[PDB]
Design a protein around this ligand. Structure first.
Ligand SMILES: COc1cc(-c2ccccc2)ncc1C(=O)Nc1ccc2c(=O)nc(-c3ccc(C(C)(C)O)cc3)[nH]c2c1
Ligand SMILES: COc1cc(-c2ccccc2)ncc1C(=O)Nc1ccc2c(=O)nc(-c3ccc(C(C)(C)O)cc3)[nH]c2c1
Ligand SMILES: COc1cc(-c2ccccc2)ncc1C(=O)Nc1ccc2c(=O)nc(-c3ccc(C(C)(C)O)cc3)[nH]c2c1
Ligand SMILES: COc1cc(-c2ccccc2)ncc1C(=O)Nc1ccc2c(=O)nc(-c3ccc(C(C)(C)O)cc3)[nH]c2c1
Ligand SMILES: COc1cc(-c2ccccc2)ncc1C(=O)Nc1ccc2c(=O)nc(-c3ccc(C(C)(C)O)cc3)[nH]c2c1
Ligand SMILES: COc1cc(-c2ccccc2)ncc1C(=O)Nc1ccc2c(=O)nc(-c3ccc(C(C)(C)O)cc3)[nH]c2c1
Ligand SMILES: [Zn+2]
Ligand SMILES: [Zn+2]
Ligand SMILES: [Zn+2]
Ligand SMILES: [Zn+2]
Ligand SMILES: [Zn+2]
Ligand SMILES: [Zn+2]
Lengths: 284, 284, 284, 284, 284, 284
């Protein structure tokens, strides 16, 4: 609330401050205004506008190494959630993909509970510009390294730290270090497989209110995520690795020899996934 | 050059014709020129430029029902093949995809021949704006209908009508009538599976010069294509169908239950594929 | 105010003055206007614009040895402080670096006070174009002399003359003449070490209001500065020098052979530091 | 040269082919030519130039999803080695840094050999635009995460795959799996420490000719690399980790708690290093 | 000449190497050649010139952070000495300044010897572009701080390290630590005063051949140098200072209250002096 | 011949020294040679010529403030005397002007001797480029101050220091301090009036050999000079002045109010005269 005042005073234009006070113009807003906008708010003299624009250019480009623009353009960042209408076709498609991918697991529903279908309470689209740009830059890199094909899938992820993921993104520094394929981020085609991990490895201690892994009351959260696979190394046996195999961008495992079990995937770089949808649900 | 001659004479500006003759300005060029370009070629009077621009607007927009613009923009349409360099990363990626997917088939090299490796002679990128736009429009549709996921893949296709495909695109009216899944366009993850169909169904009669289905001299052509699958229906048994199952956009099957065999896919709409790469090769 | 009037009168264009009065055109603004801008403000005749531009050229380049351009462009110079938002990641990074580098000192908090952590009230980015350009010119010089590596760090600085530094820059003519390594400017990796000098050498006489070196009420200020080290000379014992050792660009010392104590640095040229961040804080 | 032939024929401009043949204009050259350049080579009619430029626009931008520009822009990529002048100050700086950091090791020169000085045969600057762009993009990211500070250093790296590194960059998929700090890329401030790894871990089996780990004849190669550390976690005990600690961008450790030993660093992402200098040398 | 070979091979223009071999075109020469120069040496096709120029741009600007241009542009740097003709007025002026400023000293010729006149053997102009540019940059900087006045003087300097100065420039890291005004660089208006230091402090031990401080046979060397004083602080008593007083750019003292003794000056920054003339002489 | 040796060595082109030694190329010659001349002397490779020309540019223009060109370009300066042919009309015109302006004086030939005629032994043209350019620059100035009219005359000057004048030019620092019009340089329309000063004021003591003011044996010398008068002030009485009257460029007086006596002129700036002809003669 004072950087604008100093900037204007350094140019000898303090007589304009009243205008800038009535229009609630701050330095971050000012640096994005040209002749037309300044004319609109009431800066009628050409000389004053010329001085303001030159000062802004000297601040933003003259001292780029200090990155003042990043310091000014923090507002508006962050994540928001947009609720999908139940009657919408997108909501129906996500719900169908969630429900039709339930399957029996070798454990008798110990990790995630016993159930045959879900009860979806709401689905939210996660919007974060910085995370999305990170994901798209990595996706373009992988495409260029894989004959112009990103090999992008839509997979499931279960975690007790869903909030941290949606607000900060996927991070290989928080990988499943004890995973069967090494220290990476794991995604499942089957909804129930990811649901198993919602409360922690092996289901953790269940819901925080009743400590029941098969709780039918507490709300649960899953992530339906856009995952870039690139050239995916197909692995049949257990093998612990820290990064991707040379020349590859992810790992694909099919633990079930036959049946209805779908594939599982591992990525060793957090920027290769984006949490597009946050699903809130119960089991039945 | 008579179209522009009539257009200019109608406006009463025939005295400018000499300029248009020296600059090789055809009506298709003229309909895209504004004040800046007309000033560039030497139409210095504002009145003449105004008359020309008003006439172009009267013709193009004023009679949009006749679509004169479409009849003027036939120049430049068509396919171009851009050769990839063998030393480039794209060429190496595509060649590795071709080589690593070879496998044995139930027939003892009857349709495709006997071989373990290819000799890649050249790979070309297929560029066609109209076909690409048709494919992109269909892909956007499918994504909108499949929770913002096109489910795009890169798959091989073999056919004796490669030239027709690269100049006209994929057509469901030229579908495989006798296919095990019905009348549709078929793609394979294994390069050898598509190589089986290079000369026709079941290998046809082999190359046109030797009539040999395992000729190691004659050049063969395969397509590595961008295929939009959307929501695919999983098929385990032969079923003759004309279109995709309700609610789905393609069909995926696996004739080989287990082994090195990869999946096969069928689309019942030609616009859902694009022939990105054309590979010329020999079998060894 | 009368400079532009004299300039315009000397050209015989006094009849234009009314325009320049309405648009608040001063000579400093006018020396930066070409044909486009003069046309924008209403100088329609080409001859008038030509005369004005030639007159500006004659003043600025014709008498370059008098440097009128500098005499005209003093406006807009000076320092502005851009306030970081606490919710921003840059603010969090700076606060974490400040808080995580506190440590015990040989004196029982005599110079700085008894505390284990701070209370940050605000952090500001210091923006001064002339000082930044001086710093970057020197940094490029040192890089050219050190195999293209500036060896640049971020280090803490405490001083009772913080305002003079942020407005005028670092100046070796105001060096710490009595320092253990000679007459230079001293920086610390540990924030508490720099805090020891906030009120003067050895803590001075404490806060101005209560004269307490361990005051928990008065606001304190620190600088987190960008320091170019280049080829740094490692010193193990006290040695008073006036300048850097031959062939080097700074001095680094480690008074404590072990423990959490971090390194300390000395530069002998004021242009090798830039005070990027100004931190206002209390101790607890 | 058939790509440009097809492109020109599609536009109905085959009569220009003669010019394009004499000036050695390929499609990759053509897509970069405007009105000025086309006029330079003798395309004098405005309409022909307009058609060519519109066709280039319809290819490069109309089919952006196919990425034809990347297909055409593979020429000029790759690495060049620029020899430094032994009389130049850059060569002398690099050699002084290499020589002044030799020291003794716990093993009596078992891995790197027995010597106290090098014989520098040549030093080369490694130039690769794509790798440099990848490095600078990552450096910008890290700086934005670390209060505008990359924390960049110059460190030595020894490896038997130096050619692969200088032609393809640093790859964490080729990390030191059995390292003391886990699967990462390791750098040393002491040149002798990195020299210990020139022929392999623990010196391997020595030079390829004499099988001697202390050969004084065979030429060795070291890399002097630009390494971005960002926020570096300080490690005192061996821990096998796959990625950086949460919130940090690298790891720094000192196996020798005292003496003449300098620090060692580990990065868990290959894009955070760039091989700036290639040094060819002999031990003495 | 392998750098240009790699550069040309990466562009696919190796067939041009013959030309580059006959014209002795190295990469440093090539990065300075446009269309005109390339046409001069016989690159007649426009496409080849276009590729070469684009490659040079991608190197020099695309990888600016690596500074390839400075690596390529070390040739021709360094000092040259131009002999003045004894018949020209420049030589006569320098000699008159040398001769007319001799005087008696407090010690009876103990340090510099006993003489009234010199025998001037030769006078040379010292030319070094890098050092001159450093000097002029500092001179501009000082003038801007001293109301557009550098306060430049011509002063004598005597030192046993004249060669190091003329090849590397004046350096405050090699200051006169024990001088009466502190650690700086000292200059005199009297040539005899500087002659007292040609062999070291207090004359050292005289000529290297006779060990005679008053040798009339062995050749001596003085520097007549451009010195920027800016705002000079007037000192009347000995005072040991490391840098200039605040607000000043040099110090001036007059040890003799009155008489034939002229002033003496001290600068504390090496870039404020330039060694314009090198005088070789004998005392008589 | 070592300046060119250093210059060529710094460029790494010492293998060309042989050529430069055979063609007697010195640095002053080299700084004036382009591609054409270097090709003429046998520098056949374009790269070598390019390097030489760039080095010359970096010396002459890069270090202009040192003025290396003036140091290199002293050769050829100085005066030459061109004898006039006694049969040519220029000699005859000068002799006629000399003879026709003799007259009687208030003293009976006391200062210049007794005679009616001269014996002209020779007349020479004085050629000095530096002095001529000084004269023409001043003439341009005076014309611009006097409505485009220099007011240039041809006048006689007698002086015992003719040699100094013809080698160094006219100098108002060597003015006739005791003259009737003040401290200026005096010229006469009568040749006998100037002859009165050939041996000094009032004739001095006479010729150096016979000490005779009317010697008929010894050779005398007069100057016939181009004098710029500009706006001349008419002075009727003796009045000592140091400079011209305000607004004027010279003074004209007529001591004899009537008869065969012509006018006399005084300039107060040495650069307003040029000594065009040197006349050697005897009085008869
Ligand atoms: C490639 O996947 C596998 C392959 C094999 C195999 C074995 C032998 C042969 C062939 C294959 N066995 C097991 C897995 C597997 O574990 N897959 C999944 C699937 C979903 C999630 C999931 O939704 N979430 C977390 C999660 C998330 C966070 C965390 C914490 C928060 C603890 O970091 C831990 C696990 N892990 C998964 C892991
Ligand atoms: C879904 O795919 C199958 C499934 C089963 C199955 C059977 C039982 C149970 C479960 C599954 N059996 C066979 C196939 C199969 O034939 N797949 C392919 C794979 C590649 C190509 C190919 O590259 N090209 C043409 C082609 C191209 C052009 C033409 C025309 C009609 C143009 O000649 C005909 C066939 N067909 C393929 C067909
Ligand atoms: C290289 O640094 C040292 C080395 C050794 C040593 C001793 C033995 C062996 C090996 C090493 N001992 C002490 C220091 C030291 O004094 N370090 C610092 C660290 C921070 C600041 C700081 O933030 N501020 C001012 C400041 C600033 C301004 C002024 C005034 C305004 C008085 O000019 C005075 C001191 N000095 C520092 C000084
Ligand atoms: C962080 O560094 C260490 C810390 C500790 C420690 C232990 C306990 C406490 C505190 C600290 N112990 C050992 C190291 C260490 O190994 N340092 C280095 C230093 C240089 C190179 C080097 O130049 N090159 C390769 C290389 C390069 C390539 C390869 C491959 C796998 C490609 O062959 C393997 C190793 N490794 C280094 C490794
Ligand atoms: C400001 O100058 C003085 C002032 C007073 C004074 C004392 C009291 C009151 C008022 C004034 N007393 C002495 C000096 C003085 O020492 N003047 C000079 C004059 C010329 C040279 C010179 O040509 N060269 C080196 C040189 C050069 C190189 C070296 C090294 C260290 C490189 O050997 C040492 C001395 N010193 C000078 C020193
Ligand atoms: C404007 O001239 C006069 C005006 C009046 C006057 C008095 C009252 C009223 C109105 C007018 N009276 C005398 C003179 C006069 O002295 N005229 C000349 C004419 C020629 C030469 C000449 O050729 N040479 C040297 C010369 C040259 C060199 C030197 C030095 C000083 C170098 O020895 C001295 C005199 N003086 C002249 C002097
Ligand atoms: Zn519960
Ligand atoms: Zn055949
Ligand atoms: Zn207080
Ligand atoms: Zn060997
Ligand atoms: Zn001697
Ligand atoms: Zn005589």
């Amino acid at each position: 609330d004072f950087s604008i005042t100093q900037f204007v005073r350094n140019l000898g234009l303090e007589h304009l401050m009243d205008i800038f006070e009535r229009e609630q113009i701050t330095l971050d807003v000012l640096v994005e205004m040209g002749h037309k906008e300044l004319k609109e708010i009431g800066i009628n003299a050409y000389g004053h506008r010329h001085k303001l624009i030159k000062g802004v250019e000297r601040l933003i480009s003259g001292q780029q190494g200090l990155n003042p623009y990043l310091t000014l353009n923090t507002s508006g960042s962050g994540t928001i959630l947009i609720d999908l209408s139940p009657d919408d076709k997108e909501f129906q498609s996500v719900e169908e993909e969630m429900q039709s991918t339930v399957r029996e697991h070798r454990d008798g529903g110990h990790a995630g509970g016993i159930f045959n279908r879900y009860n979806i309470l709401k689905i939210q689209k996660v919007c974060n510009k910085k995370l999305w740009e990170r994901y798209t830059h990595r996706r373009k890199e992988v495409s260029e390294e894989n004959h112009n094909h990103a090999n992008e899938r839509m997979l499931f992820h279960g975690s007790p730290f869903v909030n941290a993921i949606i607000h900060k993104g996927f991070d290989e520094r928080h990988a499943y270090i004890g995973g069967m394929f090494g220290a990476g981020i794991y995604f499942a085609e089957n909804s129930s497989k990811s649901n198993q991990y919602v409360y922690g490895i092996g289901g953790g201690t269940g819901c925080p209110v009743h400590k029941d892994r098969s709780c039918y009351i507490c709300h649960r959260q899953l992530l339906f995520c856009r995952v870039t696979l690139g050239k995916s190394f197909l692995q049949f046996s257990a093998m612990k690795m820290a990064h991707s195999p040379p020349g590859h961008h992810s790992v694909t495992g099919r633990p079930s020899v036959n049946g209805l079990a779908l594939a599982e995937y591992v990525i060793y770089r957090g920027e290769q996934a984006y949490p597009e949808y946050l699903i809130t649900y119960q089991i039945m």
